[PDB]
Copies of this chain bind each other. A is one copy, B any other.
Amino acid sequence: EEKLRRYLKRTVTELDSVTARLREVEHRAGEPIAIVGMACRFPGDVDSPESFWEFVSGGGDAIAEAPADRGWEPDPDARLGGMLAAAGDFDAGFFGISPREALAMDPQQRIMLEISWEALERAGHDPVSLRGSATGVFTGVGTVDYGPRPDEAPDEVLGYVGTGTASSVASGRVAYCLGLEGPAMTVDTACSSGLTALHLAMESLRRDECGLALAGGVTVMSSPGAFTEFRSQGGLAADGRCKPFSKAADGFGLAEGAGVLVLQRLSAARREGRPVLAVLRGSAVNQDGASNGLTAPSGPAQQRVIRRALENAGVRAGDVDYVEAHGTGTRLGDPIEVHALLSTYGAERDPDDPLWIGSVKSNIGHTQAAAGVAGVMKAVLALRHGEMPRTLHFDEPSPQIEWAVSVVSQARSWPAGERPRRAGVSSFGISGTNAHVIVEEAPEADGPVPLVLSGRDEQAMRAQAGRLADHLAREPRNSLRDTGFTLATRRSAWEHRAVVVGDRDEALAGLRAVADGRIADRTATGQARTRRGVAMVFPGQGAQWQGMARDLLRESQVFADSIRDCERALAPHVDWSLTDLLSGARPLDRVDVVQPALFAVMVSLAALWRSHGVEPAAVVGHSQGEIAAAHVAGALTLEDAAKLVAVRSRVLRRLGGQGGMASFGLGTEQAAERIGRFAGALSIASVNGPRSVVVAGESGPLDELIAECEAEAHKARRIPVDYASHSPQVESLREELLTELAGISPVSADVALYSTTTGQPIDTATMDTAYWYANLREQVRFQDATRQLAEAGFDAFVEVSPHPVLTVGIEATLDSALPADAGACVVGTLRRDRGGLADFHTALGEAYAQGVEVDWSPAFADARPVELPVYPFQRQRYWLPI
C-alpha cells in the first residue's frame, strides 16, 4: 500500500509540473511587454521624454521653415514643416566612427545610435554591460535620401557610401556598436513602420529570440523629395500644419523624427527591478488590401485591426479611455478614421462617457516612419502624467464626420482610478499596411557618499557633472545614496573621471566645481588606464599622527572589526588598550606603543581596501612595515605578526636615549661620502629614492650632519625618535630577539613579497627569526625594491598608511626607471588630520580616477537604482549635400 501512496505523490508531481507548464507556455505567449526606457529626437528641440511631454502638454506647434543648412535648391514657395533642429549633429568618436564615415552616414543611422544608447541608460543599464547579450533590434525605416549616388560621390567617402545609407544598417550598426547579438532588422511599412517594428519585437520577446529589444523608427528628410512629390499630386497643407478632425483640414504637414523604446518581458523586468514606464499589451498588423487605390485608406480594414489588437491584448473596446489616432488632417482620411473608431470603440459606449481622441501630428507634424513611435510616447507620457493634451488647430468639428467618440480640444485630465487605464494607438500606412497597439499603465511597485562620474573626454566629464548637479537640485526627493549607487553600478566608466565625496550639500558644490573646471575639497580627478598589478606599500616611522583614524574607527565596520581582531592579538604581548588609545586620540611617544599601533591601523586599512575590491598582487614593507606586509601577504598569522611587532618594539626600548635618526635629501653616494668621516657613528638606515635617504647614529655626530646640511640647502628632517635602528647599536638586542621571537610560523604566501631586508622578492617561508633580526639591523633598500616591481610590470602603488611618506620617493624612483609619460601611478590612503570614511573614499577615488578597478558597492548598502540624466554627446555636424 504505502508505495502506492508515494506512487500518487510523484504521479501527482508529474501532473503538476505539466499543468503549470501549460499555463507557463500560454502565459508566456501573450505576456504583457514592459516599456522600460525611451529616447527621442522630435521637432520642437525635443531630445528627451521630459522635453516631449513639456512641448506637447504645453501645446507647442513646431511647424516652421526648413533649415537653410541642407543645401536644398531655393523655391518661390517656402517649405513649411516639422524639422529637426540639428539633424546632422553626431558624436562619432563616442561610437568609434571616423569623421570620414560619419559624413557618408544617413542621419537616420546616426540618430538611432545616439538614442539607442540613451534609452538603455534610462532603462537602468550601463549599455557596455550588454555587449554579447541577445538583445534584439527592430527599426522602422521608410525612405533614405541622403547621399549622392555612388557615381557622383567624393572619392574620399567611397568606401562608406553604400553601407552608410543602406536601410539594413540603421538596424545592424546599432547591433555592431553596442555588440548586441539578437536578431537585427529594418522594417519598411511606410507610416506604420514604427508600430510594425514594435509588434515584431513583442513577438520576438514572447518567443525568447531575446531577453531585451530596441523598437523604434526614424525619418529624416535629407532632401526635399517629399515636398516635391506631394506638391505634385494633392495632400500638403499650405499651412504646413495638421488640423486633425477639424472643419479646417487642408492636408498633412511634412516632418521628421526618431524614437526608441527598450522593451522587456514584463515578468523579467519585475524580477530585475527595472522601472516599468508602461505596459504594451497586444498589437496587430493588417492590410487594407483591395481599396479604392494604392494610397487610399479603408475603414473596414482599420476596424479589423482594432479588433485583432484588442483580441490580442485581452482587452475590451470599452476599457480603453483614449486613442492616439493617425489624424493627419487629410480630407479623405480623417472622416474614414473617425467612422472606423465610432463603430468599434464607440459602439461599446454610453453617450454619457465617450472615447477620447488626439493626434501629436497637431504638435510636431507628420513625422512619417517615426509617427507611431511618436504616438506611443505621447500615450505613455499621458499615462504617467494623468492628462490628455490639447489637439491644436481645432476650428469646429468637421462636418464630414457623423459623430461616444469625442476629440480632446481643451487639455483634459485622466487620473488613476479603480480600473487600470489604457490607450490605443493607431497608424495607417500609405501603402495599405495598418497597425494598432494597446498600451496600459504600469502596475504597482515598492553619512557621506561617493558620486563617481566619467566622460570619453574632459569636457564630457564636465557636462556629466553639471547635469548631475541640475538633476540633484531639481529633485531633492532623490536619495543621494541611490544616486551614487546608480552612478557606480549602472553607468559606463569612461577615460576622464571624477569622484565627488561628501553629504548632499558637498555633493552639490563638488559637482558644480567639477563642471566649472575647479576642484573642491575631497574630489579626485584623473585619466584612467588599464591597471594590472596593485602593489601595496607598507611604510614605517613618519606615518603616525596623534589622531589616527579616530574617525574611521567610528565610521567604518570593516575597519573597526580588523582593529578589534588586533586588540585581541596584542592583548597578551602588550599592556594597554588599542581602542582607548585611538579613540582617546592619545599621545604616541613610546616606541612600544607606536609601532604595533601603526601595524594594526595599516593592516586594518588593507582590509578596507580589499573589501572595496582592491587586492594586492605584491607587498613591500619598510622596517616595521614588513610585519604588516608579511601579514597582509598571508605569510603570517595575525597572532604571530602581532607578537612580532609587540616584541620587536618592547626590546627596541633598550636603545632609548642613545641615538636619533633623520631623513636627508641626498643619494647613497652623497650620503656615503659625507658620513664616512664619522667612522661608524652614523649609518645609512634606508635608501628610499634617488635623492632620499635616512641616516641613523649617535646624536652629535648626527647634529653636525644635520647642521652641515642645512648650511648648504639640504633637506634634513629630524625624525621624532629616541633610538637608532638599522645601526651597529642593534647588536645588543640580537640575543633577546632571537630568544623570544623563536616560535614564529612563517609560510610561503599567495602574494609576492619584495623584501627590503634581503633586497630580492622572496618565498615568505624564509622569514624565520634570523630574518627578523636582519630587518632591524641591516639597511632597508626600499629604492631597490621599488625598481624591481616597476621592472616586474607593476603600474599601481597604493601606500597603505595613515599618512603618505614614501609616496614622493616612489614617484622619483619611477621617473628614473619607467618609459617617461608611460603609465604607473602612486596613491596614498589617509593623510594627517584626514581619517574617517570620506577621506578613505577620496583615496579610493584617486585610485579609481587613474584606472584601478574599485568595487564601490560597500558604500551603498540596500540602495535601489534611480533615473539619472543621459550621456552628454560631444557632437559635430556632418552633412553631404546633392
Contacts and interface: CB of A to CB of B under 8 A. Distances in A.
Contacts of A295: 163
A224 interface: yes
A43 to B, nearest CB: 21
Most buried by B among A142, A225, A287: A287
A431 B139 CA distance: 14
A229 B162 contact: yes
Contacts of A161: 225, 229, 232
A284 B181 CA distance: 12
A830 interface: no
A578 to B, nearest CB: 53
Contact of A169 (B5, B8, B163, B431): B431
Interface string A229-251: 10011000000000000000000
Contact of A175 (B137, B158, B180, B433): B433
A291 B176 contact: yes
Interface string A197-231: 00010010001010000000000000111101100
A19 B11 CA distance: 12
Q: Which one of A132, A137, A141, A185 has the greatest number of beta carbons of chain B within 10 Å? A: A185
A492 to B, nearest CB: 15
A285 interface: yes
A340 to B, nearest CB: 15
A288 interface: yes
A73 interface: yes
B289 A228 contact: no
Given A169-B294, A432-B172, A433-B171, A182 B287 contact: yes
Contact of A184 (B180, B183, B209, B432): B432
A289 B175 contact: yes
A159 interface: yes
A21 interface: yes
Given A168-B189, A172-B294, A431-B184, A149 B179 contact: no
A188 interface: yes
Question: Which of under 10, 10 to 19, 20 to 34, or 35 or more describes the interface residues of A?
Answer: 35 or more
A189 B145 CA distance: 18
Nearest to A5: B4
Contacts of A226: 150, 162
A143 interface: yes
A4 to B, nearest CB: 6
B183 A186 contact: no
Given A185-B187, A225-B151, A176 B289 contact: yes
A158 to B, nearest CB: 4
A269 to B, nearest CB: 22
A787 interface: no
Contacts of A137: 287
Contacts of A294: 163, 169, 172-173, 176
A301 interface: yes
Contacts of A22: 18, 21-22, 25
A219 to B, nearest CB: 12
Given A176-B289, A181-B286, A429 B131 contact: no
A294 to B, nearest CB: 5
A180 B4 contact: no
Nearest to A227: B150
A232 B200 CA distance: 36
Given A7-B8, A151-B224, A158-B232, 12 more contacts: A11-B11, A18-B19, A22-B22, A29-B29, A134-B286, A168-B188, A169-B190, A171-B188, A171-B189, A179-B290, A185-B433, A187-B188
Interface of A: 1, 4-5, 7-8, 11-12, 14-15, 18-19, 21-22, 25-26, 29, 73, 131-132, 134, 137, 141-143, 145, 149-151, 155, 158-159, 161-163, 166-169, 171-173, 175-176, 179-190, 193, 196, 200, 203, 207, 209, 223-226, 228-229, 232-233, 284-291, 293-295, 301, 304, 429-433, 882
24 contacts: A7-B8, A8-B8, A8-B11, A11-B11, A142-B167, A142-B168, A150-B226, A150-B228, A150-B229, A150-B232, A151-B224, A151-B225, A151-B882, A158-B228, A159-B232, A166-B188, A168-B429, A169-B190, A171-B188, A171-B433, A172-B189, A173-B294, A176-B294, A186-B187
Closest 6 A-B residue pairs measured CB to CB? A172-B431, A179-B290, A183-B285, A181-B289, A167-B188, A158-B232
